[model samples]
Target: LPAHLRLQPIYWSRDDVAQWLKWAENEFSLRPIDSNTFEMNGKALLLLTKEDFRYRSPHSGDELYELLQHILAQPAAEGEYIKLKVIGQDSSEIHFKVKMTTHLKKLKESYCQRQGVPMNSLRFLFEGQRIADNHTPKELGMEEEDVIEVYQEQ
Candidate 1:
């Protein structure tokens, strides 16, 4: 058991379970466990950790992405525009308006610096998945959508 996630017998969809177990097996560098149950009587539990971001910014820090005219909240989008958050030095929201296709990468680079991340290792995402650099935000299912919450993985 860990802090952010509560471990229990979860009912998982086939796709979800496949993705998860595969990740645990391959990405985690572990043997694929085919057993219905495993004993943990003496094994040491290694837990992944995350600090409480709740303390950093009083604002929910969850629904931070808001484009004035957007409706749906896709974390990342491709094309002419995007609704993304720019975390300031003081942990405040920055209203960033820009074209997604031509200048998005450059725009995000500086934003990453402000957020205390190195530009070279930054990856942009929409709905939690990374997308190509030149994708149009509006065309990628992000029209006049509501709020999208993006946070730094510190």
Candidate 2:
């Protein structure tokens, strides 16, 4: 057992635990054994290495702050859109406004259809990293000013 976890378990406030409990069944796979008891021995613990916690934890850093906010706070507004610039293989620009939860596949299909290209021949890249069809702008940490590059992968 690590020194930090060995000390004690910090039971969260009732309101906070209740809020997290709302998503306990689905959003998180690993979770605290109970709403009140946040401990290291349970399925979910705050024992993630500092580097991993910095990148993924809601409590730690600004890197994933927006995503964490959306997850932990109130629902997204109706008609809320994320504006992204899509650049085609030939440098054609397509400005898109999509709902926060819209999947990448929908965006891919939209681009392929507009360009008259086969969907199987194209892929999307964000900051030069290939993303999967199941990923949404919300999941990717995409912002309004971000750019998504469409590439010919066939």
Candidate 3:
């Protein structure tokens, strides 16, 4: 805890990009991604709507392969979505993971919903640095390895 910070811990229980994979395992007892790495990569067996939706080729095979390489080499680099750490204030820090633009507000709302904190009470950052409110990840242009710090004020 920092001298100026006082906020409750926020727990993250879902990531939208591939929530279905985890949901299936959790809600219905279906085998998860760990059950078959090949599934998310190739031949994944997801039983959605009572029918299996197997893995297929990506939107752009080359791009997908490149993305996967970075993800593997850097781990948690980028994706259709991602959970990131943004710099916060003096009170011990709190991180808000904005997985996607469409859901950025929703992510904050979720925090508001959980903490019972006002939506205005939340702010954001990317990597271990502070970003402009208009801070897009590309602005930080996160490279192979970057850190995002968060500091929340009471």
Candidate 4:
């Protein structure tokens, strides 16, 4: 409690206020990234609080939690509709958009069908690394306008 800070004279339920604060704390733990910023959920959050401030950054924790909560609830629009250029063995390209949550195995099947390539004989690579079919685009951190090379296994 600061010297200038004054408590309101009202019938405030201490237990209820404490419970709400505890619930908010569960959203995310504070990890200091810099002298004044906190990092959470792979993002650097700026804390508005500073020394000798009258009001310490109103609801900064709640705001950060709300931001992450929405993001975790749904994938980004760009992430949801990923535009990928799938280059074939013949040095051709097939451009398509796929849902971020769609499995790679499904895309492989469709590509093989269209290209007349054997399912087991084809491999997909992203950034020169073989991509797992079980993982979704969101799981792989795929972005829009990305290229995926499809090569026939020798």
- What is the TM-score (0 to 1) of candidate 4? 0.48
In order of appearance, the predictions have TM-scores of 0.33, 0.48, 0.30, 0.48
True-vs-predicted CA distance for residue 129, candidate 3, Å: 6.0
lDDT of 1 by residue, 4-99 (tens): 122221333334333433444454455444422222111111111112212322232122112101212223433445555544335577556555
lDDT of 2 at 44: 33
| Order by TM-score, highest first | 2, 4, 1, 3
Better candidate number, 3 or 4, judged by lDDT:
4
Query: Per-residue lDDT tens digits of candidate 3, residues 1-154?
Result: 2221111112111232244334434544444344332234221221121112233322222333343333335324345344454333544434554444443455445545665667666655554444444455444565333445433435
Candidate 4 weakest lDDT stretch, 10 residues: 1-10
Please provide, for model 4 over 90-130, each residue's C-alpha lDDT reduced to its tens digit, 9 standing for 90 to 100: 78998878988888888888888997778778889988888
Tell me the deviation in Å of residue 22 in model 4: 52
- Badly placed stretches (over 4 Å) of model 3 are 1-78, 85-103, 127-154
| lDDT (Cα, tens digit) per residue for candidate 2, span 20-139 | 444442444543334433323322333344455444444433322333345334334533677889998789899888887888888888888998989878878998789788898888
Candidate that scores best on lDDT: 2
The better candidate by lDDT, 2 or 3, is: 2
Any idea what lDDT model 1 has?
0.40
